[PDB]
């Protein structure tokens, strides 16, 4: 048939609306045909968001898609849980178990409070922006008492236009004073990209600086600029751009044209917009679910207005509900299911990580398991562990009394298990201290030609250095290089 | 939003309340857009807002007041979400400043089931730093259900 | 602008500008971060033509 919708644009939502219409095209299949509305508006502004609501509720929707902020939130959520009318969004998920909001931005905290575990972290600073609730803030609050963490939060969300350069400018060297090297960016692609300016023009992007960017947004912003330096700059991504569906769709994002799909010739796509073309996938499988089961819905095209003053029900809006909340569709952020209130579940966020050549996954966080590591297991090109070969002579080599109990360089002590370390901490590397074989020191078979011992190790390439009690002799300097003599006798 | 629209019909030259954490935003734009004056004895908004009279002073100002006054370095925060976060963001943008060593814990979101549960896991970890300065950021009957 | 972008503008660096023309190219860019930059200049800004 035909099911009507509605549509909350904020003034700007140029790439979102553009990918709203690209899931138009691709996810109609004609037997029923998803016709919406527009109401571009003011999230931000409660006046706005009731008059758009009551106005498509007056104009007979099923199902309202839209984005709001922390000025709207409880807005949408008090007039979609008594009139029952469903509401579809990508924007923050909302700090509770508010009824008939199906939210697809999947959630953040878990795999923000699982990476600073992961780097072990006790000292950073958590500059935030209000924005969304305060939702992120409160969970490392209340995770900082119990797992040993000194957040050291500002605020950064109230910066005028004007002296913005000053504001950032003295921030960080506030965070300069109690020498804060570790910076978690909780802000939007908008006001990430000014503090990332900021933090270049003083000089805080060299080697020692973390900034791991609490968004699902890593590869939307201008990482180029702070690629290069020495910050080890960590970060989210739900959109992978290595997969079926996603490498299918960059194909067909970057050939539309910037005319009447604006932001739509490039080859990434921002989270929002992508949140956007996973909806209106939930959205037609809903009421194709909604088709299967033979069940048609609401009769009204009636409804004059949201506040009636005894607020009326629509029967058919649990069963919507329903509808969408069992939507198990796969899409360009991953494994899109709903639990019974509307907060996604199973699904995986990739951790990457900014490199020289470029962005880098280096695991992944699901709710299930925990961060998962992947490969890049083996690749690390290590400097080298240097076989350094002794004998076991007192006071050279010998066995520690609790040789049992130990493992590695520390089975061992003596003269040349000082020696080595004295060596290692001058020379630069790391060693292996290795017992000989035989037994011997090294001496030539008079039949076989075959040196033996530590002499032996090292012609034939099974050692790299002997620091041992190792006489200098003629017939060993043709073979081996000597030191000048550590010992005299 | 139904109760403001049938004081508008009724046609009133002053709107007397109060509002919440979820209510602030939904006045404070029906009243900056169809000019109604605000007299409310809540808290007051974190931002200018026109047409809205808080007749509730202010706290951020004696509150930090408080703390330099005692000489306090290494307190604990227990706040709650409902009449709003204002308060919580004066105390840590303060801390940055001052050297402190904020222990921001929200208390609100307790069940009055596990009221005692969670009490119990709370103090628990007030002494993991043993935490002996808690400033009680909640109204009369969660003050009194803490005290 | 290559200075800036691998982080070599930080305190530590000097940085002389063998030109008569310091105020003359976009000095805003390396004025904070801790480089020493010096350099010469003919038109003084400060006196009477
Ligand atoms: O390079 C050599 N370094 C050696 C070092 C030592 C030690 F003193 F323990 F350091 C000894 N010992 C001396 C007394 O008997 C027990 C072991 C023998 C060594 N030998 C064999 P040698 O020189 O033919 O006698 C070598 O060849």
Request: net charge negative; charged share 25%; proline share 3%.
């Amino acid at each position: 048939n035909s099911i009507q919708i509605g549509g909350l644009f904020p003034r700007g939502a140029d790439q979102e609306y553009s990918a709203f219409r690209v899931g138009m095209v691709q996810f109609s299949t004609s037997e029923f045909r998803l016709t919406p509305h527009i109401d571009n508006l003011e999230v931000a502004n409660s006046f706005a968001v009731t008059n758009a609501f009551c106005s498509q509720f007056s104009r007979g929707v099923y199902a309202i898609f839209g984005f709001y902020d922390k000025k709207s939130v409880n807005t949408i959520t008090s007039f979609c849980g008594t009139l029952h009318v469903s509401f579809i969004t990508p924007s923050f998920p909302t700090d509770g178990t508010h009824p008939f909001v199906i939210q697809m931005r999947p959630d953040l905290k878990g795999a923000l409070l699982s990476l600073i575990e992961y780097y072990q972290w006790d000292k950073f600073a958590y500059l935030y922006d209000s924005d969304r609730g305060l939702s992120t803030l409160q969970a490392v609050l209340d995770s900082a008492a119990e797992k040993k963490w000194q957040v050291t939060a500002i605020n950064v969300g109230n910066i005028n236009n004007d002296k913005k350069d000053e504001t950032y400018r003295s921030l960080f060297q506030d965070l300069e004073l109690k020498k804060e090297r570790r910076v978690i960016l909780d802000c939007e692609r908008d006001k990430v990209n000014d503090i990332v300016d900021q933090v270049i023009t003083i000089g805080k992007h060299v080697k020692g600086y973390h900034y791991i960017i609490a968004n699902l947004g890593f590869t939307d912003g201008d990482l180029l600029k702070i690629q290069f330096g020495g910050a080890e700059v960590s970060g989210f991504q739900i959109v992978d751009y290595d997969d079926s569906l996603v490498s299918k769709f960059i194909e067909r994002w970057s050939t539309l044209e910037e005319k009447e799909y604006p932001g739509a010739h490039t080859a990434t796509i921002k989270y929002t917009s992508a949140l956007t073309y996973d909806a209106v996938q939930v959205m037609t499988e809903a009421f194709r679910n909604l088709r299967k089961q033979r069940i048609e819905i609401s009769r009204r095209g009636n409804a004059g207005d949201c506040l009636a003053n005894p607020a009326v029900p629509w029967g058919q809006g649990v069963e919507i509900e329903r509808a969408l909340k069992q939507v198990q569709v796969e899409g360009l952020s991953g494994n899109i299911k709903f639990d019974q209130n509307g907060k996604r579940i199973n699904y995986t966020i990739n951790i990457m990580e900014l490199k020289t050549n470029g962005p880098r996954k280096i695991g992944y966080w699901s709710e299930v398991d925990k961060m998962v590591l992947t490969e890049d297991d083996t690749s690390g090109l290590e400097q080298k562990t240097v076989v350094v070969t002794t004998i076991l002579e007192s006071p050279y080599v010998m066995m520690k009394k609790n040789h049992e109990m130990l493992e590695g360089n520390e089975r061992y002590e003596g003269y040349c298990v000082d020696l080595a370390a004295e060596i290692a901490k001058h020379c630069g590397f790391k060693y292996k201290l290795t017992i000989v074989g035989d037994g011997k020191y090294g001496a030539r078979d008079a039949d076989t030609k075959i040196w033996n011992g530590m002499v032996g190790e090292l012609v034939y390439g099974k050692a790299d250095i002997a620091i041992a009690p190792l006489t200098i002799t003629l017939v060993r300097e043709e073979v081996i290089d000597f030191s000048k003599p550590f010992m005299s006798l």
